[PDB]
């Protein structure tokens with residue numbers, strides 16, 4: 144019953160996941176190979192993965208949609224977020240990318256409609272100090 | 277009793293007993309020797325009457341601090357028992373004993389569980405693929421639970437650990453055991469070892485144990501149809517099961533458990549029987565790879581007295597009257613008295629890897645840096661170690677261990693062979709000591725013999741590293757820990773008459789200019805002969821790290837005579853070497869000096885005067901700005917359990933350590949990579965063994981120099 148964020152095409156990093164997954168009773172090699180296959184099928188973005196454990200050390204991994212942070216960063220063209228949001232604006236985003244990410248988050252979120260997910264992404268960009276147009 | 281003499285390597289066994297410190301190993305060896313007939317009555321470590329704990333240090337610390345060898349022959353099979361200390365500070369002696377052994381024995385007590393040091397000892401035994409057998413001892417203790425320890429052993433080291441002998445006792449003093457393979461209950465209630473069928477009080481449990489042991493062994497048996505046959509109801513023959521178990525143990529695939537009462541003598545006879553039957557022979561044992569002198573790999577020799585001569589000293593001891601007592605482990609060929617044999621001093625090339633600052637290969641002793649030495653010596657009278665007594669040996673066949681005295685230059689780990697066929701057995705793994713100990717001799721007479729004494733010390737103990745500082749001029753002893761450092765100091769202070777006083781280790785430092793500055797150097801002295809007058813106006817400006825010394829000439833009009841400019845340069849270099857910070861200035865590197873002006877006298881100008889003027893100008897320029905102090909940093913890789921990660925990380929946080937990454941060593945330990953300044957590592961080992969119930973293991977290596985924060 145944990146959740147982490149890990150690079151798509153990379154497996155077995157020592158700081159983030161190794162000891163984190165070691166003390167939760169989860170086999171690491173099978174998870175790494177299955178996750179690598181899935182995220183090479185995806186091949187696009189780093190992903191958050193949620194691990195659910197059972198009493199027989201069985202592990203189930205749930206792969207969500209790419210994060211709103213990473214999706215907005217890759218859609219805006221910048222690499223790192225603004226160190227002073229709402230004071231320094233480093234990128235501009237149009238409504239088309241916003242609606243694409245809104246559809247993705249509708250596949251992810253509990254929002255009843257696409258417009259709600261678009262507003263959520265706009266708030267996420269506000270936390271990024273990135274203008275939404 | 278009789279001297280145990282062996283004429284064939286098959287009839288010889290060389291097993292090293294290992295375990296925790298004070299695991300009663302010495303008492304077990306005494307009980308086995310009494311069962312062998314060499315000793316009339318069993319000795320006691322507390323009384324100090326034991327053969328193994330005969331050295332002064334062992335009795336002083338009331339624990340095994342140095343390893344010893346005992347020889348016993350049983351059922352026509354000779355056994356070379358190698359008792360080793362059970363403390364982490366003496367891990368190198370245990371590893372040396374492991375290398376000179378074809379099997380590993382773990383002496384543990386049922387009243388205490390397997391500690392982490394014992395687990396690491398099992399790992400070390402495992403990483404030579406050594407066969408391992410579990411011996412449960414101290415069954416007379418009230419809290420001795422054979423079942424609990426057995427289980428723990430079965431769970432920890434995989435399903436390959438299954439018990440071989442089932443004790444039957446009252447829970448206080450085990451009166452005997454039940455042979456699982458033989459269905460025989462051994463009794464010692466009347467003081468006599470009696471083998472009788474079990475009365476049936478454990479017959480169901482006995483049958484369960486036979487079933488489990490048979491299923492475990494028979495898998496390791498090459499006959500895959502044996503598993504079917506046993507699962508089909510067929511009773512596998514006892515002799516066949518025995519032989520399959522013997523083969524599997526010789527394959528280092530099974531770890532049987534045999535309970536032993538060292539105090540009562542219960543189980544010693546069967547234990548000797550198991551050693552003589554189930555244990556691998558040196559012919560059965562995978563003999564270590566033998567190398568040619570020039571590093572070319574050579575095919576390992578078969579363990580036979582008729583083969584090419586191949587032996588290896590594994591211990592060096594110093595005795596005031598007898599002289600050096602070198603224990604020689606022989607693998608191939610035959611050693612005969614008065615013969616001239618070749619002494620291969622480890623051929624350091626095979627041991628020149630790593631070594632940290634000391635770069636320890638073999639026998640250190642910086643005047644003897646690396647061993648790599650070859651010499652042919654004529655041996656004297658062959659002897660076998662029996663405490664301080666030496667039983668003379670007529671001849672030494674292959675596969676046995678012997679003690680040779682009066683050896684002038686023979687050293688521990690040296691490969692002995694025929695002079696016409698020099699050989700080099702693969703050296704043992706030498707743990708790197710990481711506890712530097714700077715000392716100061718009390719007199720120069722002691723100092724002159726200090727090199728000889730330290731060389732002989734490293735000859736006796738290959739695990740001790742000695743490094744003499746070239747910058748701070750400090751002699752520094754690298755030790756494993758508190759006990760090992762104390763032993764190293766005492767042996768140096770006694771066996772060689774070298775009175776030394778421990779001093780503070782000096783971490784080497786470097787100096788460089790922190791900014792541009794100029795200095796005016798004047799050297800005028802009016803003595804009874806020629807006057808001296810030389811003035812140099814140099815300009816010193818900072819350089820990037822590692823830029824070295826650069827000289828730029830800007831003398832206009834030849835005010836400084838051009839024959840004396842090299843003297844100014846030499847004086848500047850000498851002043852950089854001698855330091856620029858006070859009376860204890862560290863060498864100055866990565867600076868540029870630009871002599872642009874100066875003054876000279878027609879009669880009072882000399883090269884020495886210009887040297888002094890340049891040195892004084894450099895000193896003034898250094899005093900005209902700040903000086904950067906550069907301290908070294910050593911990368912440290914630590915293996916610690918995952919449950920203690922945070923404590924060690926915070927301790928390094930208080931030690932200014934920069935964490936590089938936390939790598940999963942295994943399912944329960946995490947490798948921590950970090951670079952720590954050498955100052956913080958002076959007492960890192962002792963605090964870590966604290967921060968880790970001793971579980972703390974780390975290695976260090978010099979990384980680079982950095983300025984002080």
Ligand SMILES: Nc1nc2c(ncn2[C@@H]2O[C@H](COP(=O)(O)OP(=O)(O)NP(=O)(O)O)[C@@H](O)[C@H]2O)c(=O)[nH]1
Pocket residue numbers: 295296297298299300301302303304321322329338339340359360361362363413414415416417537538539
């Ligand atoms: N109950 C019990 N105590 C024992 C036995 N053997 C030794 N001891 C006790 O344990 C202490 C020393 O044991 P031990 O560590 O095996 O001695 P050592 O062999 O010199 N050290 P090491 O085990 O590391 O080689 C002493 O207090 C001694 O009385 C035994 O069979 N039973």
